[PDB]
Design an enzyme around this catalytic site. Structure first.
Site, PDB file in Angstrom:
ATOM      1  N   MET A   1       0.939  -1.136  -0.006  1.00 47.13           N
ATOM      2  CA  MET A   1      -0.008   0.061   0.066  1.00 47.13           C
ATOM      3  C   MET A   1       0.862   1.407  -0.135  1.00 47.13           C
ATOM      4  SD  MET A   1      -3.158   0.866   2.708  1.00 47.13           S
ATOM      5  CE  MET A   1      -3.871   2.327   2.575  1.00 47.13           C
TER       6      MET A   1
ATOM      7  N   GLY B   1      -1.069   8.879   0.060  1.00 45.99           N
ATOM      8  CA  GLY B   1      -2.164   8.780  -0.651  1.00 45.99           C
ATOM      9  C   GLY B   1      -2.787  10.350  -0.665  1.00 45.99           C
TER      10      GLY B   1
ATOM     11  N   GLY C   1      -6.377  12.522  -0.280  1.00 42.74           N
ATOM     12  CA  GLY C   1      -7.653  12.706   0.265  1.00 42.74           C
ATOM     13  C   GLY C   1      -8.583  13.499  -0.570  1.00 42.74           C
TER      14      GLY C   1
ATOM     15  N   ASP D   1      -7.762   8.224  -1.475  1.00 45.01           N
ATOM     16  CA  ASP D   1      -8.603   7.970  -0.782  1.00 45.01           C
ATOM     17  C   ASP D   1     -10.065   8.418  -1.000  1.00 45.01           C
ATOM     18  OD1 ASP D   1      -9.464   6.522   2.082  1.00 45.01           O
ATOM     19  OD2 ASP D   1     -10.171   8.769   2.210  1.00 45.01           O
TER      20      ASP D   1
ATOM     21  N   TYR E   1     -18.669  11.200   0.059  1.00 45.42           N
ATOM     22  CA  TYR E   1     -18.003  12.397  -0.358  1.00 45.42           C
ATOM     23  C   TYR E   1     -18.787  13.001  -1.739  1.00 45.42           C
ATOM     24  CZ  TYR E   1     -14.255  10.813   2.855  1.00 45.42           C
ATOM     25  OH  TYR E   1     -13.443  10.251   3.886  1.00 45.42           O
TER      26      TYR E   1
ATOM     27  N   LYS F   1     -15.141   3.598   0.668  1.00 47.35           N
ATOM     28  CA  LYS F   1     -15.495   3.244   2.291  1.00 47.35           C
ATOM     29  C   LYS F   1     -17.170   2.875   2.225  1.00 47.35           C
ATOM     30  CE  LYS F   1     -12.120   6.470   3.867  1.00 47.35           C
ATOM     31  NZ  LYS F   1     -12.456   7.609   2.922  1.00 47.35           N
TER      32      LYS F   1
ATOM     33  N   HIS G   1     -16.794   2.561   7.020  1.00 50.85           N
ATOM     34  CA  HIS G   1     -16.467   3.898   7.195  1.00 50.85           C
ATOM     35  C   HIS G   1     -16.468   4.339   8.751  1.00 50.85           C
ATOM     36  CE1 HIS G   1     -16.541   8.032   4.802  1.00 50.85           C
ATOM     37  NE2 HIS G   1     -15.906   8.024   5.881  1.00 50.85           N
TER      38      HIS G   1
HETATM   39  N1  LIG Z   1     -12.235   7.541   7.305  1.00 48.10           N
HETATM   40  C1  LIG Z   1     -12.911   8.946   7.772  1.00 48.10           C
HETATM   41  O1  LIG Z   1     -13.718   8.979   8.472  1.00 48.10           O
HETATM   42  C2  LIG Z   1     -12.169  10.257   7.606  1.00 48.10           C
HETATM   43  C3  LIG Z   1     -12.577  11.394   7.966  1.00 48.10           C
HETATM   44  C4  LIG Z   1     -11.837  12.624   7.528  1.00 48.10           C
HETATM   45  C5  LIG Z   1     -11.016  12.636   6.498  1.00 48.10           C
HETATM   46  N2  LIG Z   1     -10.797  11.405   5.822  1.00 48.10           N
HETATM   47  C6  LIG Z   1      -9.904  11.090   4.784  1.00 48.10           C
HETATM   48  O2  LIG Z   1      -8.738  11.885   5.045  1.00 48.10           O
HETATM   49  C7  LIG Z   1      -8.480  13.176   4.049  1.00 48.10           C
HETATM   50  C8  LIG Z   1      -7.421  14.086   4.684  1.00 48.10           C
HETATM   51  O3  LIG Z   1      -8.356  14.672   5.771  1.00 48.10           O
HETATM   52  P1  LIG Z   1      -9.139  16.135   5.507  1.00 48.10           P
HETATM   53  O4  LIG Z   1      -9.602  16.590   4.096  1.00 48.10           O
HETATM   54  O5  LIG Z   1      -9.934  16.124   6.723  1.00 48.10           O
HETATM   55  O6  LIG Z   1      -7.962  17.340   5.932  1.00 48.10           O
HETATM   56  P2  LIG Z   1      -6.517  17.511   5.844  1.00 48.10           P
HETATM   57  O7  LIG Z   1      -5.909  16.806   4.721  1.00 48.10           O
HETATM   58  O8  LIG Z   1      -5.730  17.509   7.142  1.00 48.10           O
HETATM   59  O9  LIG Z   1      -6.507  19.143   5.371  1.00 48.10           O
HETATM   60  C9  LIG Z   1      -7.058  19.432   4.061  1.00 48.10           C
HETATM   61  C10 LIG Z   1      -7.202  21.023   4.034  1.00 48.10           C
HETATM   62  O10 LIG Z   1      -5.636  21.386   4.171  1.00 48.10           O
HETATM   63  C11 LIG Z   1      -5.416  22.570   2.954  1.00 48.10           C
HETATM   64  N3  LIG Z   1      -4.037  22.114   2.488  1.00 48.10           N
HETATM   65  C12 LIG Z   1      -3.517  20.845   1.817  1.00 48.10           C
HETATM   66  N4  LIG Z   1      -2.192  20.811   1.607  1.00 48.10           N
HETATM   67  C13 LIG Z   1      -1.891  22.046   2.109  1.00 48.10           C
HETATM   68  C14 LIG Z   1      -0.650  22.825   2.128  1.00 48.10           C
HETATM   69  N5  LIG Z   1       0.539  21.952   1.676  1.00 48.10           N
HETATM   70  N6  LIG Z   1      -0.420  23.883   2.858  1.00 48.10           N
HETATM   71  C15 LIG Z   1      -1.463  24.623   3.530  1.00 48.10           C
HETATM   72  N7  LIG Z   1      -2.681  23.879   3.382  1.00 48.10           N
HETATM   73  C16 LIG Z   1      -2.942  22.730   2.819  1.00 48.10           C
HETATM   74  C17 LIG Z   1      -6.395  21.830   1.910  1.00 48.10           C
HETATM   75  O11 LIG Z   1      -6.675  23.091   1.189  1.00 48.10           O
HETATM   76  P3  LIG Z   1      -6.680  22.817  -0.470  1.00 48.10           P
HETATM   77  O12 LIG Z   1      -7.800  21.503  -0.917  1.00 48.10           O
HETATM   78  O13 LIG Z   1      -7.527  24.235  -0.650  1.00 48.10           O
HETATM   79  O14 LIG Z   1      -5.658  22.825  -1.159  1.00 48.10           O
HETATM   80  C18 LIG Z   1      -7.686  21.799   2.885  1.00 48.10           C
HETATM   81  O15 LIG Z   1      -8.225  22.734   3.326  1.00 48.10           O
HETATM   82  C19 LIG Z   1     -10.060  13.154   3.578  1.00 48.10           C
HETATM   83  O16 LIG Z   1     -10.063  14.423   2.387  1.00 48.10           O
HETATM   84  C20 LIG Z   1     -10.333  12.121   3.556  1.00 48.10           C
HETATM   85  O17 LIG Z   1     -10.034  11.241   2.300  1.00 48.10           O
HETATM   86  C21 LIG Z   1     -11.586  10.018   6.166  1.00 48.10           C
HETATM   87  O1  LIG Z   2     -16.697  10.599   7.491  1.00 51.27           O
HETATM   88  C1  LIG Z   2     -15.641  11.356   6.840  1.00 51.27           C
HETATM   89  O2  LIG Z   2     -15.138  10.655   6.101  1.00 51.27           O
HETATM   90  C2  LIG Z   2     -15.884  12.736   7.023  1.00 51.27           C
HETATM   91  C3  LIG Z   2     -16.886  13.323   7.735  1.00 51.27           C
HETATM   92  N1  LIG Z   2     -16.820  13.309   9.031  1.00 51.27           N
HETATM   93  N2  LIG Z   2     -18.120  13.885   9.807  1.00 51.27           N
HETATM   94  C4  LIG Z   2     -18.039  14.003  11.130  1.00 51.27           C
HETATM   95  C5  LIG Z   2     -18.604  12.512  11.434  1.00 51.27           C
HETATM   96  N3  LIG Z   2     -18.637  11.994  12.516  1.00 51.27           N
HETATM   97  C6  LIG Z   2     -19.127  10.785  12.681  1.00 51.27           C
HETATM   98  C7  LIG Z   2     -19.485   9.941  13.718  1.00 51.27           C
HETATM   99  C8  LIG Z   2     -20.062   8.601  13.634  1.00 51.27           C
HETATM  100  C9  LIG Z   2     -19.984   7.700  15.032  1.00 51.27           C
HETATM  101  F1  LIG Z   2     -19.294   6.682  14.751  1.00 51.27           F
HETATM  102  F2  LIG Z   2     -19.262   8.130  15.643  1.00 51.27           F
HETATM  103  F3  LIG Z   2     -21.271   7.560  15.256  1.00 51.27           F
HETATM  104  C10 LIG Z   2     -20.364   8.182  12.412  1.00 51.27           C
HETATM  105  C11 LIG Z   2     -20.174   8.893  11.202  1.00 51.27           C
HETATM  106  C12 LIG Z   2     -19.648  10.183  11.448  1.00 51.27           C
HETATM  107  S1  LIG Z   2     -19.373  11.442  10.235  1.00 51.27           S
HETATM  108  C13 LIG Z   2     -19.124  14.423   8.957  1.00 51.27           C
HETATM  109  O3  LIG Z   2     -20.070  14.844   9.446  1.00 51.27           O
HETATM  110  C14 LIG Z   2     -19.183  14.063   7.531  1.00 51.27           C
HETATM  111  C15 LIG Z   2     -20.285  14.465   6.643  1.00 51.27           C
HETATM  112  C16 LIG Z   2     -20.499  14.370   5.330  1.00 51.27           C
HETATM  113  C17 LIG Z   2     -19.053  13.765   4.786  1.00 51.27           C
HETATM  114  C18 LIG Z   2     -18.062  13.342   5.316  1.00 51.27           C
HETATM  115  C19 LIG Z   2     -17.916  13.445   6.882  1.00 51.27           C
END
Ligand SMILES: NC(=O)c1ccc[n+]([C@@H]2O[C@H](COP(=O)([O-])OP(=O)(O)OC[C@H]3O[C@@H](n4cnc5c(N)ncnc54)[C@H](OP(=O)(O)O)[C@@H]3O)[C@@H](O)[C@H]2O)c1
Ligand SMILES: O=C(O)Cc1nn(Cc2nc3cc(C(F)(F)F)ccc3s2)c(=O)c2ccccc12
EC number: 1.1.1.21
Length: 315
Positions: free
Chosen positions: A12, A16, A18, A43, A48, A77, A110
């Site tokens: 992996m 990656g 986001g 990712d 989304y 996811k 997710h």
């Molecule tokens: N599994 C889940 O529940 C979950 C939850 C949250 C996030 N994720 C995944 O994680 C990814 C990353 O997290 P995130 O989107 O929450 O936030 P992040 O990557 O922590 O921050 C994204 C923010 O940072 C800015 N940015 C990016 N590169 C920069 C740089 N070099 N200098 C200054 N600012 C910069 C971006 O602006 P611009 O885009 O305007 O450049 C955007 O406003 C998500 O997009 C998603 O794919 C998964």
């Molecule tokens: O989901 C992302 O990838 C980003 C993400 N995060 N969150 C904050 C969240 N907090 C949670 C808590 C639970 C819980 F498990 F805790 F119940 C379940 C689900 C969620 S969503 C959001 O509200 C959200 C809404 C739209 C699209 C993406 C997101």
């Protein structure tokens, strides 16, 4: 080294792109620029609402023969409203069609919480509490295992699972495939030392989300702490002649995590990738870990009474 070995035997990419909050009119170009400058992992998620546009970029770079499919690592996811046995295959297939793929490299549960199925991603009662589904983590996990056994996904995993929820799956009666990854929030304000050592001790690779503290999260408040503006982190960057985002990206890499910074800005997309050519010291690493304050970007209030809410528990 650009990739980490998973317990399914595949490799992996530790960096990656986001895509949460990436506007649908910008993410196609963002993903194209990202593959052009070296990203091989994207990712994604159905929630989304931009997987079609992500897919357009993936398909174009495959067609152009910029990359081979075997060289890409595409993650998506299963959203909360699809935990039910009968909905998992369709959900995955909708993601696959939108991404223009015949398989995913990794498909994640997710969040550990199932929600009432329907059109609404966050079904609410009249006081704003999420409406649960009665589905449990273990039955959802068996449905994920079926995806592997149908060739639609190469690896399955979880996201936002706590210690006890991971253990619940590892201890599942009849477990057929261990989770490959647990993708969780992780950054110097939420350092996750316990959950990370537990998963790693079990061969589960950890992916860190919101590594930059998600400055574009739609619920930001000015009084919230700001990683990118923290002078302490800025000082470490300056010492290494790198940007603060670069330090925030290299930090989880050195903890044997995968990290998935989001950007739609071409200059930042490239900046964020230029992180394989410098090393944080042990002292830097322990200094960044000292900034922990258990601050979470992602913990929706509407979900805190769900039976399976993951963040009451300490880790
Ligand atoms: N599994 C889940 O529940 C979950 C939850 C949250 C996030 N994720 C995944 O994680 C990814 C990353 O997290 P995130 O989107 O929450 O936030 P992040 O990557 O922590 O921050 C994204 C923010 O940072 C800015 N940015 C990016 N590169 C920069 C740089 N070099 N200098 C200054 N600012 C910069 C971006 O602006 P611009 O885009 O305007 O450049 C955007 O406003 C998500 O997009 C998603 O794919 C998964
Ligand atoms: O989901 C992302 O990838 C980003 C993400 N995060 N969150 C904050 C969240 N907090 C949670 C808590 C639970 C819980 F498990 F805790 F119940 C379940 C689900 C969620 S969503 C959001 O509200 C959200 C809404 C739209 C699209 C993406 C997101």
């Amino acid at each position: 080294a650009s990739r980490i070995l998973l317990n399914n035997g595949a490799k992996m990419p530790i960096l990656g792109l986001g895509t949460w909050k990436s506007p649908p009119g910008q993410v196609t170009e963002a993903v194209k620029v990202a593959i052009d400058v070296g990203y091989r992992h994207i990712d994604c998620a159905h929630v989304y609402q931009n997987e079609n546009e992500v897919g357009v970029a993936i398909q174009e770079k495959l067609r152009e023969q910029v990359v081979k499919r075997e060289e890409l690592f595409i993650v998506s996811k299963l959203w909360c409203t699809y935990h039910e046995k009968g909905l998992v295959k369709g959900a995955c297939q909708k993601t696959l069609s939108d991404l223009k793929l015949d398989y995913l490299d990794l498909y994640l549960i997710h969040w550990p919480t199932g929600f009432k199925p329907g059109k609404e991603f966050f079904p609410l009662d009249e006081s704003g509490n999420v409406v649960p589904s009665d589905t449990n983590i273990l039955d959802t996990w068996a449905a994920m295992e079926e995806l592997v056994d149908e060739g639609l996904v190469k690896a399955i995993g979880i996201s936002n699972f706590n210690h006890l929820q991971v253990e619940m799956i590892l201890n599942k009666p009849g477990l057929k495939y261990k989770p490959a990854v647990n993708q969780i929030e992780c950054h110097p304000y939420l350092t996750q030392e316990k959950l990370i050592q537990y998963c790693q001790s079990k061969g589960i690779v950890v992916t860190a989300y919101s590594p930059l503290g998600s400055p574009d999260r739609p619920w930001a408040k000015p009084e919230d702490p700001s990683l990118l503006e923290d002078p302490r982190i800025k000082a470490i960057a300056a010492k290494h002649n790198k940007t603060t985002a670069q330090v925030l990206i290299r930090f989880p890499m050195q903890r044997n995590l995968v990290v998935i910074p989001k950007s739609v800005t071409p200059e930042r997309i490239a900046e964020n990738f230029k992180v394989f050519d410098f090393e944080l010291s042990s002292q830097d690493m322990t200094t960044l870990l000292s900034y922990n304050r258990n601050w979470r970007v992602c913990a929706a209030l509407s979900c805190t009474s769900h039976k399976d809410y993951p963040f009451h528990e300490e880790f």
